[PDB]
Design a protein around this motif. Structure first.
Motif, PDB file in Angstrom:
ATOM      1  N   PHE A  11       0.707 -42.676  75.176  1.00 12.10           N
ATOM      2  CA  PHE A  11       2.067 -42.250  74.913  1.00 12.10           C
ATOM      3  C   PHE A  11       2.539 -42.672  73.518  1.00 12.10           C
ATOM      4  O   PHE A  11       3.063 -41.850  72.763  1.00 12.10           O
ATOM      5  N   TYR A  22      10.098 -42.888  64.106  1.00 13.54           N
ATOM      6  CA  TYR A  22      10.597 -43.606  65.292  1.00 13.54           C
ATOM      7  C   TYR A  22      10.084 -45.051  65.291  1.00 13.54           C
ATOM      8  O   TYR A  22      10.746 -45.949  65.788  1.00 13.54           O
ATOM      9  N   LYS A  25      12.067 -48.328  64.167  1.00  4.84           N
ATOM     10  CA  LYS A  25      13.090 -48.975  64.992  1.00  4.84           C
ATOM     11  C   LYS A  25      12.551 -50.166  65.785  1.00  4.84           C
ATOM     12  O   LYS A  25      13.305 -50.837  66.471  1.00  4.84           O
ATOM     13  N   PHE A  26      11.253 -50.417  65.676  1.00  7.54           N
ATOM     14  CA  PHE A  26      10.555 -51.429  66.476  1.00  7.54           C
ATOM     15  C   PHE A  26      10.085 -52.625  65.662  1.00  7.54           C
ATOM     16  O   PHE A  26       9.945 -52.561  64.425  1.00  7.54           O
ATOM     17  N   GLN A  45       6.409 -54.630  73.907  1.00  6.59           N
ATOM     18  CA  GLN A  45       7.072 -53.343  74.139  1.00  6.59           C
ATOM     19  C   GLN A  45       6.297 -52.480  75.138  1.00  6.59           C
ATOM     20  O   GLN A  45       6.899 -51.902  76.056  1.00  6.59           O
ATOM     21  N   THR A  49       7.396 -51.093  78.905  1.00  8.47           N
ATOM     22  CA  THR A  49       7.321 -49.665  79.226  1.00  8.47           C
ATOM     23  C   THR A  49       6.542 -49.440  80.538  1.00  8.47           C
ATOM     24  O   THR A  49       6.982 -48.665  81.410  1.00  8.47           O
ATOM     25  N   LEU A  66      18.838 -48.107  81.080  1.00 11.73           N
ATOM     26  CA  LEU A  66      17.881 -47.822  80.023  1.00 11.73           C
ATOM     27  C   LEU A  66      18.477 -46.834  79.022  1.00 11.73           C
ATOM     28  O   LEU A  66      18.304 -47.004  77.808  1.00 11.73           O
ATOM     29  N   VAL A  75      19.394 -43.908  69.727  1.00  9.75           N
ATOM     30  CA  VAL A  75      18.356 -43.014  70.222  1.00  9.75           C
ATOM     31  C   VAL A  75      18.997 -42.152  71.285  1.00  9.75           C
ATOM     32  O   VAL A  75      19.598 -42.669  72.240  1.00  9.75           O
ATOM     33  N   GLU A  79      15.468 -37.254  70.926  1.00 12.05           N
ATOM     34  CA  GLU A  79      14.317 -38.147  70.918  1.00 12.05           C
ATOM     35  C   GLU A  79      13.681 -38.246  72.286  1.00 12.05           C
ATOM     36  O   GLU A  79      12.465 -38.215  72.374  1.00 12.05           O
ATOM     37  N   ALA A  83       9.953 -37.543  73.532  1.00 14.49           N
ATOM     38  CA  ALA A  83       9.188 -38.511  74.289  1.00 14.49           C
ATOM     39  C   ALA A  83       8.655 -37.920  75.590  1.00 14.49           C
ATOM     40  O   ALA A  83       7.537 -38.225  75.980  1.00 14.49           O
ATOM     41  N   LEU A  87       4.820 -38.126  76.667  1.00 16.97           N
ATOM     42  CA  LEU A  87       4.427 -38.772  77.909  1.00 16.97           C
ATOM     43  C   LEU A  87       3.677 -37.822  78.852  1.00 16.97           C
ATOM     44  O   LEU A  87       2.755 -38.240  79.547  1.00 16.97           O
TER      45      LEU A  87
HETATM   46  C1  HEM Z   1       9.451 -41.885  77.635  1.00 19.11           C
HETATM   47  C2  HEM Z   1      10.632 -42.297  77.172  1.00 19.11           C
HETATM   48  C3  HEM Z   1      10.944 -43.792  76.903  1.00 19.11           C
HETATM   49  C4  HEM Z   1      10.824 -44.851  77.727  1.00 19.11           C
HETATM   50  C5  HEM Z   1      10.298 -44.882  79.179  1.00 19.11           C
HETATM   51  C6  HEM Z   1      11.277 -46.026  77.011  1.00 19.11           C
HETATM   52  C7  HEM Z   1      11.273 -47.311  77.517  1.00 19.11           C
HETATM   53  C8  HEM Z   1      11.792 -48.420  76.886  1.00 19.11           C
HETATM   54  C9  HEM Z   1      11.942 -49.722  77.474  1.00 19.11           C
HETATM   55  C10 HEM Z   1      11.512 -50.056  78.906  1.00 19.11           C
HETATM   56  C11 HEM Z   1      12.505 -50.535  76.574  1.00 19.11           C
HETATM   57  C12 HEM Z   1      12.896 -52.027  76.717  1.00 19.11           C
HETATM   58  C13 HEM Z   1      14.358 -52.094  77.194  1.00 19.11           C
HETATM   59  C14 HEM Z   1      14.843 -53.496  77.493  1.00 19.11           C
HETATM   60  O1  HEM Z   1      14.247 -54.495  77.027  1.00 19.11           O
HETATM   61  O2  HEM Z   1      15.877 -53.641  78.194  1.00 19.11           O
HETATM   62  C15 HEM Z   1      12.732 -49.758  75.363  1.00 19.11           C
HETATM   63  C16 HEM Z   1      13.273 -50.217  74.174  1.00 19.11           C
HETATM   64  C17 HEM Z   1      13.372 -49.488  73.007  1.00 19.11           C
HETATM   65  N1  HEM Z   1      13.129 -48.123  72.881  1.00 19.11           N
HETATM   66 FE1  HEM Z   1      12.390 -46.880  74.289  1.00 19.11          FE
HETATM   67  N2  HEM Z   1      11.654 -45.611  75.731  1.00 19.11           N
HETATM   68  C18 HEM Z   1      11.501 -44.243  75.650  1.00 19.11           C
HETATM   69  C19 HEM Z   1      11.761 -43.472  74.518  1.00 19.11           C
HETATM   70  C20 HEM Z   1      12.166 -43.956  73.275  1.00 19.11           C
HETATM   71  C21 HEM Z   1      12.241 -43.208  72.033  1.00 19.11           C
HETATM   72  C22 HEM Z   1      11.900 -41.706  71.913  1.00 19.11           C
HETATM   73  C23 HEM Z   1      12.652 -44.035  71.062  1.00 19.11           C
HETATM   74  C24 HEM Z   1      12.872 -43.641  69.587  1.00 19.11           C
HETATM   75  C25 HEM Z   1      12.804 -44.500  68.564  1.00 19.11           C
HETATM   76  C26 HEM Z   1      12.851 -45.343  71.646  1.00 19.11           C
HETATM   77  C27 HEM Z   1      13.267 -46.480  71.008  1.00 19.11           C
HETATM   78  C28 HEM Z   1      13.376 -47.730  71.556  1.00 19.11           C
HETATM   79  C29 HEM Z   1      13.787 -48.874  70.782  1.00 19.11           C
HETATM   80  C30 HEM Z   1      14.140 -48.896  69.296  1.00 19.11           C
HETATM   81  C31 HEM Z   1      13.786 -50.034  71.743  1.00 19.11           C
HETATM   82  C32 HEM Z   1      14.135 -51.490  71.447  1.00 19.11           C
HETATM   83  C33 HEM Z   1      12.839 -52.199  71.071  1.00 19.11           C
HETATM   84  C34 HEM Z   1      13.131 -53.623  70.666  1.00 19.11           C
HETATM   85  O3  HEM Z   1      13.929 -54.326  71.354  1.00 19.11           O
HETATM   86  O4  HEM Z   1      12.577 -54.049  69.636  1.00 19.11           O
HETATM   87  N3  HEM Z   1      12.524 -45.264  72.975  1.00 19.11           N
HETATM   88  N4  HEM Z   1      12.299 -48.471  75.594  1.00 19.11           N
END
Ligand code: HEM
Length: 110
Positions: A11, A22, A25-26, A45, A49, A66, A75, A79, A83, A87
């Motif tokens: 993924f 994207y 942002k990480f 991360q 996921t 979430l 986001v 986006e 995703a 996925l």
């Molecule tokens: C299949 C779709 C996605 C899933 C299942 C997913 C899942 C997650 C999960 C489980 C977290 C951690 C949340 C937490 O700690 O409470 C997270 C954080 C994050 N997600 Fe996603 N995400 C998805 C799509 C995206 C997309 C498309 C972006 C675009 C940039 C994104 C950007 C981020 C960012 C920037 C964080 C924070 C990371 C950090 O704390 O450093 N996500 N996501």
């Protein structure tokens, strides 16, 4: 048991190959795609996921929570539609069930 860790690795490869910005942002901003597995921020991360996927399948996922956290990183729905496609490709590559319904739950709050 389904190898969700491998699905999630695929993924992120698909996602960042199609949308490299994207990754900025990480905590693993700038890291080569073929190096993500050796990066501590990525490992954390990817683990969250995998946990989310297992929660969605197990019935305990907080999709609204979430979604709200992703809005908190600027986001949005576009986006997440990207995703969802990435996925779906990852799931298919591993013979895993599609997770579209779970992603639609998050999208309903975006
Ligand atoms: C299949 C779709 C996605 C899933 C299942 C997913 C899942 C997650 C999960 C489980 C977290 C951690 C949340 C937490 O700690 O409470 C997270 C954080 C994050 N997600 Fe996603 N995400 C998805 C799509 C995206 C997309 C498309 C972006 C675009 C940039 C994104 C950007 C981020 C960012 C920037 C964080 C924070 C990371 C950090 O704390 O450093 N996500 N996501």
């Amino acid at each position: 048991m389904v190898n969700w860790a491998a699905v999630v690795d695929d993924f992120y490869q698909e996602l960042f190959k199609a949308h490299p910005e994207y990754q900025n942002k990480f905590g693993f901003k700038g890291v080569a795609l073929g190096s993500l597995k050796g990066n501590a921020a990525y490992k954390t991360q990817a683990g969250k996921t995998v946990d989310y996927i297992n929660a969605a399948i197990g019935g305990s996922a907080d999709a609204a929570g979430l979604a709200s956290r992703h809005k908190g990183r600027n986001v949005g729905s576009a986006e997440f539609h990207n995703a969802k496609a990435c996925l779906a490709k990852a799931c298919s590559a591993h013979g895993a069930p599609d997770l579209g319904h779970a992603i639609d739950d998050i999208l309903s709050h975006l």
